[PDB]
Amino acid sequence: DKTLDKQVAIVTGASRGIGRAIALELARRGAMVIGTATTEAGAEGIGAAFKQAGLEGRGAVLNVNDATAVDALVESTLKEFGALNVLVNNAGITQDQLAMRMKDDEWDAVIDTNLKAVFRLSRAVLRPMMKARGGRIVNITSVVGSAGNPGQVNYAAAKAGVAGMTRALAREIGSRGITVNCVAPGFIDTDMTKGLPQEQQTALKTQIPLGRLGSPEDIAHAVAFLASPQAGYITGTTLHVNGGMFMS
């Protein structure tokens, strides 16, 4: 079970759904996990979920667009725990709109949170990891980064860009013993999808050879596998977790 024993992990966007299941699963494998949320109710919910699961772990408030707070989290984690072994980038918003009508700020907010923030966090964690000659960065992207989707040109750009960044990072970090990969969910059962009406939910399932939405745990198990020492020869890749919706 404890393949991540004594490792220290940061999961951004860990309050609900996918990020929560990732946080819990990394703690389950022995990792000490800081999950982040955008608000205090979220950070508290992250703590409470660890404790409900009978696991160690913390919630913290983080605006991934605030370089000062990102750098602060890296410093405090290193100070309290002496190490930073795993980064999982799961913070990410949508601001969907037809490209024709899409405003500059609707573009920017998606690019900032989903691409720029991923770069900044990755660069921040890489300094200690490169020095330690160990680490894992796992970026939670999305099938939309590989296949595109009307109304999500901003989201498609940002997530394809994270994959692009990932490959270049892997080539940059070389023999330094850090792997960088993406996990690309398809349509996962969450609050965001549970709230949409039955007709649209079925329209999603039609797209999927397995005939069901995935679970946040599907994503958590894929991330935990990549975070493991036993996945140390995998880097620069995307692990598609989409029920066969997109294949490569």
Enzyme catalytic residues: 155
Binding flag, residue 136, a copy of itself (CB under 8 A): no
CB closer to a copy of itself out of 1 and 191: 1
Q: Using an 8 Å Cβ cutoff, are 33 and 27 in contact?
A: yes
Tell me which of 164, 192, 194, 196 binds a copy of itself, using CB under 8 A.
Answer: 164
Question: Mask 6-45, x = binds a copy of itself (CB under 8 A)?
Answer: ----------------------------------------
State which of positions 78-107 bind a copy of itself (CB under 8 A): 98-100, 102, 104, 107
Which of 6/131 has CB closer to a copy of itself? 131
Q: Are 219 and 185 in contact (CB under 8 A)?
A: yes
Residue 122 within binding range of a copy of itself, rule CB under 8 A: yes
Select from 182, 162, 146, 156 the least CA-distant residue to 64: 162
How far is it, in rounded angstroms, from Cα 152 to Cα 165?
19
Site string for a copy of itself, 206-225 (x = CB under 8 A): --xxxxx-xx-xx--xx--x
Residues annotated within a binding site: 13-16, 38, 63-64, 90, 155-159, 188
